[PDB]
Structure formats: structure tokens, C-alpha cells
Write a protein that binds this ligand. Structure first.
Ligand SMILES: Nc1ncnc2c1ncn2[C@@H]1O[C@H](COP(=O)(O)OP(=O)(O)O)[C@@H](O)[C@H]1O
Ligand SMILES: Nc1ncnc2c1ncn2[C@@H]1O[C@H](COP(=O)(O)OP(=O)(O)O)[C@@H](O)[C@H]1O
Ligand SMILES: Nc1ncnc2c1ncn2[C@@H]1O[C@H](COP(=O)(O)OP(=O)(O)O)[C@@H](O)[C@H]1O
Lengths: 104, 104, 104
């Protein structure tokens, strides 16, 4: 089963102007759900405007979601950002109180 | 021991108007500490205003904290949000430099 | 190898006025990359302004990065904040599509 039967958090920091394309890519890969945070950052003094996108996934392989975001967020210039995958141990839907991988 | 002797991050995305009730519920369950982030999101094009609540816990079972948030954040309409539990490997209190589960 | 050959997320919640000193400390320890989020919180009703700093690390020990942040963020008064270390399972550089610990 995808994600070894578990749940993963895909966290991407990307350019603000690529958010629209990332949203479209996520919808197209079948994992439209996302939470966006406005952030500031630097990679390798003054911080630049960035966007954090978070997608918790279970049914869709986390590497597939990461690839979709990366392809949509890419420009080829320094500052394009990074995607990280973190383990999630449980999930609860607030509306129903449903828990586990099927809660999403 | 609670949380199998470890530390967990409870991350909830909820409606902004439910934050006050969630804060009260967290205080009542004995885990008042929280960090709030203003975010935007969609579940299953335009993003809606949401709130992210993060609570790192050790002494209080993470599922108890999650249940408290879910009950307070519930309305029964689509958009109520989700709660995720993630593993935390260590914690440090900045004021004292105390580390581990007792750092909170 | 550092971080047991893996990748870690160091997440710190600190006073806003300490961000400049934390940035300098991170550069000095050799891990300048960071993402900053403006947040609100309380520790142990009204929430106070705080800053969340996130640093994903592989080459630099996560406890070294945490110590650098803690020392720079310290004042000795309640409200100084906390640092948490979370596991990260994978990373992707958007610009190159490079993956794994060497993606950072
Ligand atoms: N290791 C990291 N930890 C936390 N945030 C990072 C990390 N690497 C990159 N970021 C975030 O992604 C943004 C762009 O990073 P990146 O494209 O690596 O910058 P650069 O090309 O200048 O090294 C940064 O401004 C920061 O917000
Ligand atoms: N799998 C997920 N990953 C990231 N964020 C999510 C996920 N599911 C829900 N969210 C967040 O919670 C909010 C409300 O979600 P939800 O109640 O599931 O919406 P819906 O009922 O329309 O499917 C979303 O707008 C988003 O911010
Ligand atoms: N267990 C926790 N979970 C989530 N956020 C926390 C936690 N502990 C502290 N914080 C964050 O760090 C900030 C400062 O915390 P802290 O210095 O512990 O406050 P206090 O000294 O009043 O207990 C809080 O306002 C909150 O944003």
C-alpha cells in the first residue's frame, strides 16, 4: 500500500508566484488538500518572501506529491526551495471524528 | 506512561472562529500551551482563511488533546478541518536549557 | 555520521526581538538556512507575538543547531520559548530535483 500503509506530511517551501501552479499540480495528481502559510527565509542576512505548502497524504504516494510540487515550483534559479517529507502517526477529521489513514 | 514515554506534536487546522473555544478546551484538559499560525487552505481553487494550532505534549496523551480540540472545533459542516499527530524526538526549554520530556 | 545519517527538523518558537541574534548564531554554526513564520502563543488567555524558526539539517548535528538557537534566544524570563526536534524522512531540492540527505 502507498506510504507503507501510513500517513505522511509533505512540506514545501516555494516561491510565492508558483503557488497557483502548485495548486493545479496537486489537483491533477489527485491530492488537492493543502494548507498554505506565508513565511520568510534564506538558503545557503535579509529574508525573502516565500510560501510554505503542507499536504498530509495517505492514499497518494508522498514522493508523487513531492514530484508534482517540485515540477510546478521549478524555475532553475537559486531560491526555488525545498520539499521535506515527515512522518505522521495519526489523523482525525474534526467534522466526523473519524480517525486513522482513512481520515486522510 | 503517556505517549509511550515520548513527545508528540498535535497539529490542528480549524476554523478561525473556533480558536477561542479550542483555547478553553486545551486549558481544561491541562495542556494550555499552544502556538497559533494564520493559514489558508482547501480540502476535497480559492483558499479559505483557517487557523493552525500546534501543541507539543508529553505528560498529556496526544489523543486526549486531539479529542479536546476536535470537540471544540466541530460544527458539522465541511471545512471543519483536521488534526494530525507527529513524533517529536527532543525538546529544549530556552529559558533554562532543560531538555527531554520534562522540558515539555 | 551526524543525526544518525538522517535528516531532522529543528523548530524553535522564540521572542521576535531575538530573531536577528538567532540568524547570526545559525550562520556561525554553519547552518544558515531557515524559514521564519510569524505566530502567536501562550505557555503555562491572550496570545503573545512570537516567531517560529525552522531549520532542516543533515550535516550539522540537530542538538548543535538547537543549542545555538537557545543560547541566542535566551533572556531568562518566562516567554523565552522552546525548541523541538522532529524526524524528516526525505528532502528534495526544487531547483535540481536532487533528493536525500545531500539535498540538505
Ligand atoms: N534546510 C532548510 N531549512 C529550512 N528552510 C529552508 C532550508 N533550505 C531552504 N529553505 C527555505 O527555502 C527557501 C529557498 O531555499 P533555497 O532555494 O535553498 O535557497 P538558495 O538557493 O539560496 O540556497 C529559503 O529561503 C528557506 O525559506
Ligand atoms: N490532507 C490535508 N493536508 C493539509 N491540509 C489539510 C488537509 N485536509 C484538510 N486540510 C486543511 O484543513 C482545512 C479544512 O479541511 P476540510 O474540513 O477537510 O475541508 P473539506 O471539508 O472541504 O474537505 C483545509 O482548508 C486545509 O487548510
Ligand atoms: N508545548 C508547547 N506547544 C506549543 N507551543 C509552545 C509550547 N510551549 C511553548 N510554546 C510556545 O512558545 C512560547 C513561549 O513559551 P514559554 O517560554 O514556555 O512560555 P511560559 O514561560 O509562559 O510557559 C509560547 O507562547 C508558545 O508560542
Amino acid at each position: 500500500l502507498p506510504n507503507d500503509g501510513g500517513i505522511k506530511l509533505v512540506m514545501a517551501i516555494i516561491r510565492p508566484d508558483k503557488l497557483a501552479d502548485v495548486k493545479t499540480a496537486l489537483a491533477e495528481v489527485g491530492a488537492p488538500s493543502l494548507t498554505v502559510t506565508n513565511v520568510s527565509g534564506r538558503g545557503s542576512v535579509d529574508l525573502h518572501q516565500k510560501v510554505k505548502v503542507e499536504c498530509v497524504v495517505a492514499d497518494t504516494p508522498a514522493e508523487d506529491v513531492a514530484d508534482a510540487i517540485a515540477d510546478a515550483a521549478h524555475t532553475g534559479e537559486k531560491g526555488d526551495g525545498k520539499i521535506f517529507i515527515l512522518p505522521v502517526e495519526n489523523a482525525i477529521q474534526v467534522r466526523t471524528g473519524k480517525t486513522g489513514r482513512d481520515a486522510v
